[PDB]
Write a protein that binds this ligand. Sequence first.
Ligand code: CLA
Ligand code: CLA
Ligand code: CLA
Ligand code: CLA
Ligand SMILES: CC1=C(/C=C/C(C)=C/C=C/C(C)=C/C=C/C=C(C)/C=C/C=C(C)/C=C/C2=C(C)CCCC2(C)C)C(C)(C)CCC1
Ligand SMILES: CC1=C(/C=C/C(C)=C/C=C/C(C)=C/C=C/C=C(C)/C=C/C=C(C)/C=C/C2=C(C)CCCC2(C)C)C(C)(C)CCC1
Ligand SMILES: CC1=C(/C=C/C(C)=C/C=C/C(C)=C/C=C/C=C(C)/C=C/C=C(C)/C=C/C2=C(C)CCCC2(C)C)C(C)(C)CCC1
Ligand SMILES: CCCCCCCCCCCCO[C@@H]1O[C@H](CO)[C@@H](O[C@H]2O[C@H](CO)[C@@H](O)[C@H](O)[C@H]2O)[C@H](O)[C@H]1O
Ligand SMILES: CCCCCCCCCCCCO[C@@H]1O[C@H](CO)[C@@H](O[C@H]2O[C@H](CO)[C@@H](O)[C@H](O)[C@H]2O)[C@H](O)[C@H]1O
Ligand SMILES: CCCCCCCS[C@@H]1O[C@H](CO)[C@@H](O)[C@H](O)[C@H]1O
Ligand code: OEX
Ligand SMILES: [Ca+2]
Ligand SMILES: [Cl-]
Ligand SMILES: [Cl-]
Ligand SMILES: [Fe+2]
Lengths: 34, 342, 137, 30, 451, 334, 80
Amino acid sequence: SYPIFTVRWVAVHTLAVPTIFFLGAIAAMQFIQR
Amino acid sequence: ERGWFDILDDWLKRDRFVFVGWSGILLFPCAYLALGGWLTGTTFVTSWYTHGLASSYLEGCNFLTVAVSTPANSMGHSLLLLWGPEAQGDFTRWCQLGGLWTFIALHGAFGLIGFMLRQFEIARLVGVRPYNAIAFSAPIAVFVSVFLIYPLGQSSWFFAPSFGVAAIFRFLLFFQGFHNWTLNPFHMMGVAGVLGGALLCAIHGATVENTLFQDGEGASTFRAFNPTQAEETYSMVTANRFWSQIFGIAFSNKRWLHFFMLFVPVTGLWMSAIGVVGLALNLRSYDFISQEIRAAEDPEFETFYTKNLLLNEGIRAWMAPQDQPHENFVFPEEVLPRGNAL
Amino acid sequence: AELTPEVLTVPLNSEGKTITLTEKQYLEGKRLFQYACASCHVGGITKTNPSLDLRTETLALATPPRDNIEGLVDYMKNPTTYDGEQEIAEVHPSLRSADIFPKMRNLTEKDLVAIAGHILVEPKILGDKWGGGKVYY
Amino acid sequence: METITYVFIFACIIALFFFAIFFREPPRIT
Amino acid sequence: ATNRDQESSGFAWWAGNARLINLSGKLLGAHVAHAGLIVFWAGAMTLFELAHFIPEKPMYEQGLILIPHIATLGWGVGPGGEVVDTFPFFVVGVVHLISSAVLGFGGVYHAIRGPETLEEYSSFFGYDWKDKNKMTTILGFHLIVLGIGALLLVAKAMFFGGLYDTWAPGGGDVRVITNPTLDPRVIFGYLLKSPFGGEGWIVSVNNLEDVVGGHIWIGLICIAGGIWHILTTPFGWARRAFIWSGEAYLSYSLGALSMMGFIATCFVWFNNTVYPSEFYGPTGPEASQAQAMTFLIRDQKLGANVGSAQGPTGLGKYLMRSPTGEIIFGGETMRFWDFRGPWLEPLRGPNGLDLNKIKNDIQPWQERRAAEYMTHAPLGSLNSVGGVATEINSVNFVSPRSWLATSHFVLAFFFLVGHLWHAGRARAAAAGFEKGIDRESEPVLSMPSLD
Amino acid sequence: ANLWERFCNWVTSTDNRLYVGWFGVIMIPTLLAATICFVIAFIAAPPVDIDGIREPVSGSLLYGNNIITGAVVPSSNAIGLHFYPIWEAASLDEWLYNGGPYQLIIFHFLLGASCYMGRQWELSYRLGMRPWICVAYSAPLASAFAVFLIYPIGQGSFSDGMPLGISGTFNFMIVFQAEHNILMHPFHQLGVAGVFGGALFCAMHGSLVTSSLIRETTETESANYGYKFGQEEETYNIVAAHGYFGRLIFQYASFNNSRSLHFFLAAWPVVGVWFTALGISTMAFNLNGFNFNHSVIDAKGNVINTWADIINRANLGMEVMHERNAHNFPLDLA
Amino acid sequence: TTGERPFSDIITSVRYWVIHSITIPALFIAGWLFVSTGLAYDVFGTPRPDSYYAQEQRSIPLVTDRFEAKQQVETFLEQL
Ligand code: CLA
Ligand code: CLA
Ligand code: CLA
Ligand code: CLA
Ligand SMILES: CC1=C(/C=C/C(C)=C/C=C/C(C)=C/C=C/C=C(C)/C=C/C=C(C)/C=C/C2=C(C)CCCC2(C)C)C(C)(C)CCC1
Ligand SMILES: CC1=C(/C=C/C(C)=C/C=C/C(C)=C/C=C/C=C(C)/C=C/C=C(C)/C=C/C2=C(C)CCCC2(C)C)C(C)(C)CCC1
Ligand SMILES: CC1=C(/C=C/C(C)=C/C=C/C(C)=C/C=C/C=C(C)/C=C/C=C(C)/C=C/C2=C(C)CCCC2(C)C)C(C)(C)CCC1
Ligand SMILES: CCCCCCCCCCCCO[C@@H]1O[C@H](CO)[C@@H](O[C@H]2O[C@H](CO)[C@@H](O)[C@H](O)[C@H]2O)[C@H](O)[C@H]1O
Ligand SMILES: CCCCCCCCCCCCO[C@@H]1O[C@H](CO)[C@@H](O[C@H]2O[C@H](CO)[C@@H](O)[C@H](O)[C@H]2O)[C@H](O)[C@H]1O
Ligand SMILES: CCCCCCCS[C@@H]1O[C@H](CO)[C@@H](O)[C@H](O)[C@H]1O
Ligand code: OEX
Ligand SMILES: [Ca+2]
Ligand SMILES: [Cl-]
Ligand SMILES: [Cl-]
Ligand SMILES: [Fe+2]
């Protein structure tokens, strides 16, 4: 009986979610040329 | 039936992986926004319109050169609220005007308040004296003096530190060239508190690790300690003899030792903040008047003090046109201070 | 702003004829300038003799004129002093002195044109910075 | 005057070192 | 798990290799596998260098540290250090890379398959760290091996094509060494030279006859010393002076390697004989001198009388005196007047730089060399932007001298630290207090009070 | 016993108020000499021709300095790395002009401080301690070697050694930034993380242990009387401390093992300072901080400045002004 | 402990990886497209390589007026 929605879960995702989005954005930027 | 306030208190103070508390309501959103604003700006946002610089990964900067830069000098000390009279609700314009600077600085300030309230809140619940909160007043005094008071004394937020690695380096070098900040005795006390603190950290960790009692058979000695053990894990008597014979004095009281470890770097940071309050006003330790009188009358008199001033004069002339673009400085090649050849 | 065909149009000769370089030519010229010339001419100055730079106006007043492709290519084969009076291949890299300046050994004619074009185009991009030295960094 | 003052303070600090070392409060184990 | 966890070995995972101290078989594996990593890097790095190499650019514009070592031995190069043949580089790379597979094989075998201890299997290959005679014997074998290595350099220099000689009359070239210096007054003289400016201890070695001669001496000294240690056991004064344990012997060797590292740093920074500037680029001193020579040449061509030209300070702008009178270049390069190099020596006479020779005899090749070296001074950024720290991006250059000096200072330093760590540890463990103070026999509690 | 044996027992005695030891026999005379020469020079040395251009810089109090401006001035650039003892000079007057005191001081100090480090190993052996306090001291020591010896070796002159004074130190720092871009060098960045972090953990540890002191005193007494030198029992509750800090961050971010904690307190500053020492010792051979000057370029090829370009402008100002009569040729190659 | 499932249990479970082998790549690709479509430029007002300067100006579009800085930027943008 371990819960899934917890304060910890929310805290983890407020960071992990944007982080992965940002890492994808920054990966793309490496192919931009002037 | 207990009251809603008390019920909310229970829930805020549940033992969980990440403690929340009443302090959490201020801390978490302000900290998250300060940090998210920095990551957003450094990844995506320019400084072309405020400084004439590129400042984001998007434009090609690296981790060393990205920043969230201060607003333009013509903004003065505007709060620069998203819904304020400069941006008028336009997110894109807000970003271009430096609105993320004030966003990060003000949410960061409220977040530091929330962090130190957290330190008091947790100390009270666990039953300890709140010295950790008290020590944290140093980082607060630094953040407030440098990010807030200093620019408030100057023309505008423009001259605050911009949030970035290279940008901060620029802030150091500006302070040398314009304020002669190395000469300032409040800075000097800061340096002594930081290097003295790092000295205490190293010497104390090393001393305990080299006067440990043999409490196990392991050659790796970390296992031979239990958190609930009543006994000292290292010999204070032996540590004291060692340092008395090596350096001439030694700690003999462990409570004094640990208090001194709080005192030194906290006091140093506080001294440095006082100096920066002075610099807000250009109230510098820039010169020694007696040195100037002599040097002016005696062209063979030279010291390291007069040498450093020549360096400062170079920094100001060579950096100001690009670092202060609102001034529209044009310094013809012929007026630039230079020594021979270079 | 852009690196347009116009930016890339420079004088071919002293008689006023122009040549429009390709973007591939521009990039080759930068690369080859780095390979063979930048050690002394980084940024349009000359480290071993700062009195002579690669500004277009300086090049125009050289003898023979060096403010055009043909003048530059000829310079790279048979370099002279600024007044045209002395041949300096023995102390300046050229095709003629490729035995003693070995980086010049595999430079083709096309390579010379590319490098000449870099020299002419860069000031149209950078202005006073080209040949300006540290004051303009 | 200034040189005497700076040297005097220094000399006092060196004297303080001598007393703080050799006329310290002895550490007492009991 | 014969000793492969913390509970049984007494060492945590991060000190895992300390579990090997008394496991001679696996420890031989560790060593042999490690030797294979070194040989692997030599081989693969060489091939990488060769694949990237453009023979008409200087080596030093291309970030090569290994090709330069091969060329200095006379392989692949001709007059002026021009590359005449890359195949000797390819051979050196390939043969190391193949040999590394063999060492790697032996290492993996001994580490994971062969007998963990060797003492049961062989009394010749087994060893106890406390057996003073066995330790001096193995030492002796390795001495003989090192001696032979030094004599291979002699063999290359005297019988198999010679060495690249930057000082060769008429210009740098490969040259066979027929008259190596054997006089002990010269060879051991170098060791008693001051390490300070104008002297430079062994770093001052400036001709290949001394270099070759010095290796004949070391070859024979090491072979003799090795025989000696096979035939003898430590004297009593040695027995009482040292700690006799694996960790102690490691510490001694760490101290020795730290020293050697600092020496190597100085060698590559200042010496342009065994690190020829043709391959490694100019020395820091060299390039600063070469700047002064460049502007002297330029300004004299414009009509300057460089002897009588007083600079802003009152010292000569181009030429001045050293503190012992010798004529030297002026400006900041006054500090570098102990510099000596083949492009500059023709201008030097018994009183230092000779003004007649400066005015009349400077050849175009000297102007070229000086301009080259001035523009490849060993200054640059960590991202390899050549030049002073305020330089703009354009030139991708950091001197091999800088890479080699910096790396080896870093390694020598951390090796000094390792020497202290392990020497302090070996002493404590030999005496029985490396795991802490015995609470019931705390030595300080039996000592009188200080006051 | 015989005289040698007695001497050896006295040298190595664990009962001398200050330990002597064999490292001590070299340390004592070399530190006394460096100290005495330093004190006299700082008060009364005349001006020294540091840059070898006959432009002597006044360092001493009697010649117009104060505590903040004063220094013992490095030896002349004309000397370079040459050994300049007193007996190389034709007279004390010459020796003073050319900066002889600097070399006597720094060589005796580095020798003596090196023996200080050995003496730390030595006393630890005599007391039956673990041996690695001397390893922690190797960090500041390495730093001293870097600025007084290794940087001069690399640049070819003791005139580029750090001066022995407050304003001289700032001068050395500003020129170093000009010539090496030290702020952009990751080893200096490791150094700052080491000292800012050492300060931070210093205050953290002090505050956490102080937070959790066991009540042993009344309100009208310093809590420090609650600990008696040599007592066997710990004077604070580490479990209460860990309970606090684990909640501040999260549980596994806090140490409950005092040995692990103390090792971390040792390691973090020592390592960062080893890196910063190595920053100075590798910039000594001119491998410099990152250079992103003109790294960002627009579609036409216009340079788009970054904060790295603005640093560059500041560095230029330092560069063109430093040692303003000493350069004749256009590049500062050392 | 405080009652939440250990991280080590979670991230070694098959269910976690079934969920996250979808959500992790999806977020990555969405961030990629935020840049590759040019949308990042327009949300944040960041110049593209071709929009720092008009073709013949070498004057930076610095904001000089607090209360119509919004309009100054607007005008600087129309003049490209
Ligand atoms: C504890 C959490 C917290 C705190 C302390 C702050 C604090 C701040 N925010 Mg942040 N913010 C937060 C959470 C927080 N925020 C969250 C969760 C978001 C995402 C939604 C944001 C998004 C955000 C943005 C986008 C911006 C800010 C800005 C600000 C600043 C100005 C706020 C302001 O003037 O409010 C004024 C409002 C109050 C003080 C509330 C008062 C309520 C009182 C007690 C009762 C009065 C009610 C009244 C009767 C209602 C009827 C009105 C009627 C007459 C019409 C300030 C630094 C601005 C800033 O940073 O600019 C640089 C800005 O642009 N915030
Ligand atoms: C040069 C680096 C190096 C070398 C040569 C060794 C060597 C060794 N270690 Mg140390 N170790 C190192 C680095 C190294 N270690 C590092 C960095 C750490 C910290 C992570 C450790 C931590 C450590 C611990 C904690 C222990 C050792 C132990 C050992 C030994 C037994 C290994 C074993 O049981 O493998 C078991 C592993 C396997 C069977 C998996 C495969 C291993 C092989 C060798 C991989 C080879 C791959 C290679 C590509 C094959 C090429 C083949 C081809 C040539 C034909 C062995 C002699 C153990 C001990 O001392 O035993 C007495 C032990 O407990 N080491
Ligand atoms: C320093 C390195 C070294 C040392 C001390 C040993 C020692 C040992 N080995 Mg390992 N081994 C090594 C490296 C080493 N080996 C390498 C590189 C490989 C891969 C080829 C092996 C593969 C290997 C296997 C597969 C076995 C051993 C075994 C043995 C044992 C018996 C050896 C014997 O009696 O031969 C006596 C002498 C000879 C047979 C003639 C020697 C011929 C060599 C080639 C002459 C050397 C020439 C020259 C000096 C080369 C120097 C190379 C250098 C430049 C790198 C002994 C414990 C056996 C064992 O452990 O028993 C259970 C065993 O089965 N060895
Ligand atoms: C890796 C090489 C190596 C190693 C580790 C050893 C190790 C050992 N040797 Mg062997 N030895 C070697 C090579 C080596 N040796 C060689 C090549 C020879 C041939 C010449 C010898 C000839 C030899 C003899 C004749 C003896 C030893 C002895 C010993 C033992 C004592 C060493 C000692 O106390 O030195 C420490 C040095 C001293 C105590 C001398 C005083 C310290 C001075 C002042 C240090 C100066 C250093 C300084 C940095 C300056 C350097 C430059 C200088 C020229 C100015 C020890 C087992 C002794 C022994 O036990 O024989 C069985 C012994 O009598 N060796
Ligand atoms: C601003 C704003 C806002 C907010 C936003 C947010 C909140 C955001 C967040 C965001 C985020 C949250 C992001 C993140 C990102 C991240 C990243 C980008 C990361 C990266 C990383 C890396 C890269 C790593 C690296 C490393 C390290 C660190 C160490 C170890 C090693 C290595 C190197 C790996 C709002 C809307 C309210 C409003 C308006 C404005
Ligand atoms: C013990 C141990 C360890 C270690 C290991 C090692 C150290 C190993 C080594 C190994 C080695 C050391 C290996 C090597 C290998 C090699 C090889 C495999 C080679 C091959 C070659 C080839 C195949 C070639 C080819 C070619 C040619 C011939 C020509 C040109 C081209 C080319 C290159 C392609 C560890 C840490 C894991 C841990 C556990 C234990
Ligand atoms: C090749 C060459 C050469 C030659 C070389 C030689 C001939 C060398 C030799 C070398 C040697 C011949 C070396 C030696 C070394 C030694 C040492 C390094 C020692 C050490 C010692 C110790 C460390 C000790 C310690 C101790 C003490 C002091 C006290 C008691 C205790 C004990 C024992 C611990 C030349 C330069 C001509 C040229 C180039 C090339
Ligand atoms: C510049 C370098 C010049 C030095 C040359 C070095 C030569 C190496 C050979 C040294 C031979 C001396 O040998 C060594 O002498 C000392 C001097 O009393 C001895 O003597 C002693 O040992 C005991 C053992 O605990 C001591 O407590 C005692 O005080 C002492 O008399 C050593 O036990 C002996 O082994
Ligand atoms: C135990 C050590 C204690 C040391 C105490 C030493 C005091 C006794 C010796 C007195 C020597 C000082 O003598 C010194 O000489 C020169 C003359 O060429 C003077 O000349 C100087 O004047 C001014 C004084 O402000 C200086 O700024 C200047 O750089 C210099 O030209 C000094 O002002 C004078 O004080
Ligand atoms: C360990 C393998 C060594 C292989 C050595 C190859 C011989 S080396 C060979 O020798 C000739 C003179 O004898 C020289 O003239 C020639 O230049 C040289 O490369
Ligand atoms: O001396 Mn002291 O500082 Ca090293 O760089 Mn060059 O030299 Mn001088 O100029 Mn910059
Ligand atoms: Ca384009
Ligand atoms: Cl110069
Ligand atoms: Cl200066
Ligand atoms: Fe502690």
